[PDB]
Assembly symmetry: D2
Homo-oligomer: 225 residues x 4
């Protein structure tokens, strides 16, 4: 994947609505695609300060930055120069849902993200609308081919002020802009993620996030096969 | 609201994405707000023809047109001149999800809708993407106050070619732009809907829809004297 | 059309189950008017009482023969006798609890007989159900059509809470006849309006009387199409 | 510091046997199963030999019952407290609902006890709405992939969240997820609760006979924290 260098920059545009609060964000980032690490610096540029926890947006800000181990084919790095899209719905156990659609392209050496967010039904006294959340635990995504692309299933735990967790889960479809004939698809595998907030300011209108992500098989040996 | 006359027109703009496919629609319509009937004439103006059944968009194109029976307060008509919003997620039994957020306003005597659609994960070879659908049956929405607005719960049956159905359900929150103290909130009630397609052309890039909607209580007697 | 189902019928029920990991058994006796769609059941918790959860979560598990089928809608349940029928259902509450139930309905010496198994899980420890903050169900409208070799129902119900709020639940049911499909006239798409009410209680909900009225009908609104 | 290996759960030996009784219904098909097994509780490995003793042959894929047949056999690494092994002699329960993407649901409740040195399981199954033409009722499934369960305290016990992939005849997968609550019969004051952590599982069918009325299953299960470093110093 020669177009994806050891170090890459990214730029992002996001617009969305959560319940009926409209906003726009931009971000600039850098990372090491083959090491599976990256940092994004994010600005809320319209609609700030947001009345909901920024944590619900965190997964919507970068699939080229996954260290693919154990010979697992890399759906995302193979997709350049054409790029790829993703689409996702996250459901929170207390009723809120966050839907996101995303385009990833490569333009003059910079990876470009365009994201649309539609979140609905977040409960008025829930931790998200009360801004009583404290970031995500690590998680393991489970992936396999489906629907002409790559399906992901994830489950994440959101830390709460006062202790304990709010659960969510999401279903993602990643779609390449290359035709299947020109891709080596992975089989069933996992991606371990640790998505962290490293800095913030001004009531979450400035946020820095770091992610480490590694594609791998399960640690445990198989009796069969 | 006296601002809502016995006959009203509406205009709509919509933009969205379904499974990576971007599109825009506009529409014009007319209806009888107190009688609960309306017709909208819809154009796909960008991104057409759509690669999915237009039926999944039908509920996203009008809450001021509900006949409120039995004295049930009308959350929507009371909200003018300020207007109201709605937000919704529809989940289909085969994996698709259709999220929508909407703004309703009143401008120069015309009701104005602005809608954003985000649909994801519709199965690639399923009924929606293969255009095997034939419109909706009637349904009964269940409503009550929640979350600082009015909560709706709906379950609908989409007719399929060959005679079956595809199930979906949705959860809606309707929010007024008037403060709660200036509204008479309804209690628990139902709205019966019949949302029908009455014309189409050009691979569903022109569609006409009619809806009738009537708010009511359950008319079965109650041993406990409840509505 | 269904000679075995008389204007007045009696019922007897046995139920065993677990909610979270609390085991219990119930019995009940009832009577109703199958063609008028009304019935009353008098229910006893006979093992495992008092229950640590609101009895409201069990209400829908205690009677499909008692629905007034209007407008010519075929009656899947009354037609199923003498062989009888079964139902299976999962109810999901918005705060995480789930209540699964499977039921057998038979007719024995002129009495309708119910055998029910309940498995409820993950009800939140400090939630409305375990803290007994519930006040019975609102009315509701079930939506039905054939599927999976039987009759599919979809329901959504609102549980009243102390203080005036609601807890939502929904459920999916499959009703299955013990008659072969060839010997049944299947209904098409239709609704059943229900009003399920508690009329008496004693002894920390270890004695409960419930009444239900149920009516099968089409939507009242006219169609432009068809 | 305890003086002896495994001093924090002495009734659980390095080798243990188990016996199980199960009864249930799927759609409205009633059945009963029994099983006997053995495993190495601290190593996280075990094998169960299962018989369908009433209601066989089953008209649905046995794969949907696989997770209902053993929490004492998890290798807890990295010092993670072992909720299950700590719970003896009193034992523990679990309760779970599994939702399949094509509409079927499999609910299960379970009691675990220790009787004369043998671990005893009593399980109740209630499965509903499995679609008539789905892979489960058509018996077109081919066992589970590995998975990673996510766990943390909640509801006075230990919450688990799981997502699994069921291999299908012809290729591809059917998705399910489940939510579990594990509950100790010891009071909270006598337990050292773990924090947030993961359990990797690989649940495999190693033998079957007579239209799935005899099945042998092996499982390996290992509790761990996420491997990856944390910029914030978290586990």
């Amino acid at each position: 994947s020669e177009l994806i260098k050891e170090n890459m920059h990214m730029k992002l545009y996001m617009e969305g609505t959560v319940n009926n609060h409209h906003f726009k964000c931009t971000s600039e980032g850098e990372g090491k695609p083959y090491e599976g690490t990256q940092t994004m610096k994010i600005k809320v540029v319209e609609g700030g300060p947001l009345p909901f926890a920024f944590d619900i947006l965190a997964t919507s800000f970068s699939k080229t930055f996954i260290n693919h181990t154990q010979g697992i084919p890399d759906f995302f790095k193979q997709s350049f120069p054409e790029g790829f899209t993703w689409e996702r719905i996250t459901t929170y156990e207390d009723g809120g849902v966050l839907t996101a659609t995303q385009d990833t392209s490569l333009q003059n050496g910079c990876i470009i993200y365009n994201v649309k967010i539609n979140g609905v039904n977040f409960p008025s006294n829930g931790s998200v609308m009360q801004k009583k959340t404290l970031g995500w635990e690590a998680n393991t995504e489970m992936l396999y081919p489906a629907d002409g692309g790559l399906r992901g299933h994830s489950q994440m735990a959101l830390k709460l002020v006062g202790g304990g967790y709010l659960h969510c889960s999401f279903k993602t479809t990643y779609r390449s802009k290359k035709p299947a004939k020109n891709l080596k698809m992975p089989g069933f595998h996992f991606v371990d993620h640790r998505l962290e907030r490293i800095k913030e300011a001004d009531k979450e209108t400035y946020v820095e996030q770091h992610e480490m992500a590694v594609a791998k098989y399960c640690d445990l040996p198989s009796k069969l096969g």
